[model samples]
Target: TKPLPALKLALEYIVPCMNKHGICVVDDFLGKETGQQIGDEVRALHDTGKFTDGQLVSQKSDSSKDIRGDKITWIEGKEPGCETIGLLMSSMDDLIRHCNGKLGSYKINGRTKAMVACYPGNGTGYVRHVDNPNGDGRCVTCIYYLNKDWDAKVSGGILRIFPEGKAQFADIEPKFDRLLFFWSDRRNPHEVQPAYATRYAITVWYFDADERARAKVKYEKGLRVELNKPS
Candidate 1:
């Protein structure tokens, strides 16, 4: 078991921050050694042709569109170099369960899925967009940065978080072992600023069954309107 002393503190902090601003930032989320291993695993697998185009929620898998610059990859918990991934996911999974128990189910529902996201060199970044993507109903997005010793000046893959009802956005550095989390509904639109250097990262999408129904209802109505619109 990962002695997650920070788990309780993070859980206590997330509810209020998410309620007010829809964002949460955690430092030292992963250990220094484990973080390095995660980046290594991603590079190892991605170098062996494991990455494909990152997908959208409409298709939800391997659906690449011209608008995005991130490559997608998935590694199971038991993969060869993914031991750290499994370890990290376990603590996070526990955090979800305990958080749901305390913070209630309306905000989060304790279900999650993880994936590896790579932005290859040459200033790759995704445009500003919400991760909900229509029917996915993702309540929260967790990004764990595995890249070590990132320089903000030369490489510019900083996460730009556009808070709800805020005039200016907050920029987050992609430092090692730092975990970024935020609500994923209509609020909190965000994107990555393009970085010239290759970047390896881990992303986890949190799900809420109740919110899924709510977001799906909204998505279906939007779908009908789109279909009725003149071509």
Candidate 2:
């Protein structure tokens, strides 16, 4: 049901993977030009402003920064030049709508879109966990890496995804224009390896309507953010 022509085939290949393994990773997700633009935009945001600390996926009372090391800001699907991102964000929304037909657990309400930055040398990585935590109703989590020229050999920002009943981890490089998608529920608990260099990315979480009067994801105190609609 996602109507993005440029991303039609990419979406086609992705859903099957979701049906098969509950997760999928795609390279060159937004095309080179858009990917390059996103990388540049995120880099500017990180360099120009301050970001609040983000916590573990599960915000248990005893949780601390040691569990998840990153800084983040939220977007409510609008901003200058940000409107362009809505094209894909909306498509992702459409994708989630499509999934509800295939899955019973794929239900959620309000969702959050965020920008993240992690520094590897400074303990910037997340411990193993699932996305839909504390009953926030997150159904799908998608992250687009903005690193322009990333080298897995040098960079440490690897996404470690644990497959169902699998002992080993699947490592994915956070490269430019790369999009990683996964079901937010368990059986897909995952983490990010510390990044030696700065890592920039945009993460969008879509939810089922029953989770809340509106779609929303759980976050620590002062961690949750909401972007105001355009005036």
Candidate 3:
């Protein structure tokens, strides 16, 4: 099924309502063609020497304290012979346009950083937490599933979305090509459940500032930002 039209409509409707509420799930936002391309690219990165494995670091403000197993994070532009950057950028552009440039006060700017995350079958699950640290809420979170033939009943690693002040969990299947986009703020609390098998995903973060500014502050200062990895 074509996801662009539906995705576009959903984003338009949800952007204004997100902060007041909590989370919005847009399933099948990426069509099969783009989905397969993303999946192939992730596998290629793993096959090649470009992909890097990672481990979670403890954060003081974390809701869950336990940390175990590796969380691999593959950065774009740094990967050798990887041409997936252009494709990802184009896809994201479509999303930004869908928001009609009014998602938030923050500018679309550019891709501050892009990453491919691999959570192994036996790997540790991420505890419930919000994405932003400084609480400025300048970051935007985009997660695209790369796993094929994913069955929610047989396999684990479903994304649990928690509404503000609610104890109940809204489980969203981590299906292939499904893109979950949301503003990274204090309002939304989320976590990734453990998987029965290895789970592949491409996660991209767009900053309010340009690439150069974000890079200089993030890399130069040794910020140790955890994109599924320890500094």
Candidate 3 regions exceeding 4 Å error are: 1-11, 14-22, 56-68, 77-81, 98-101, 166-168, 209-231
The sequence of per-residue lDDT tens digits that candidate 2 reaches over residues 126-171 is 7778776555656667887778788767767888898768666678
Residue-pair clashes per prediction, in order, are 0, 12, 0
Model 2 is weakest, by summed lDDT over 10 consecutive residues, at 221-230
TM-score of each: 0.81, 0.77, 0.73
Q: Report the Cα lDDT for residue 205, model 1.
A: 69
lDDT of 1 at 143: 82
Q: State the C-alpha lDDT per candidate.
A: 0.69, 0.64, 0.60
Residue pairs with backbone atoms closer than 3 Å in model 3 (clashes):
none
Q: Lowest lDDT 10-mer window, candidate 3?
A: 220-229
Give the TM-score (vs. native) of candidate 3. 0.73
Report the error of model 1 at residue 86, Å: 1.3
Candidate No. with top TM-score: 1
Candidate 2 segments exceeding 4 Å error: 1-11, 55-65, 97-100, 103-110, 120-123, 211-231
Model 1: runs farther than 4 Å from truth? 1-7, 55-65, 101-107, 110-112, 133-135, 213-231
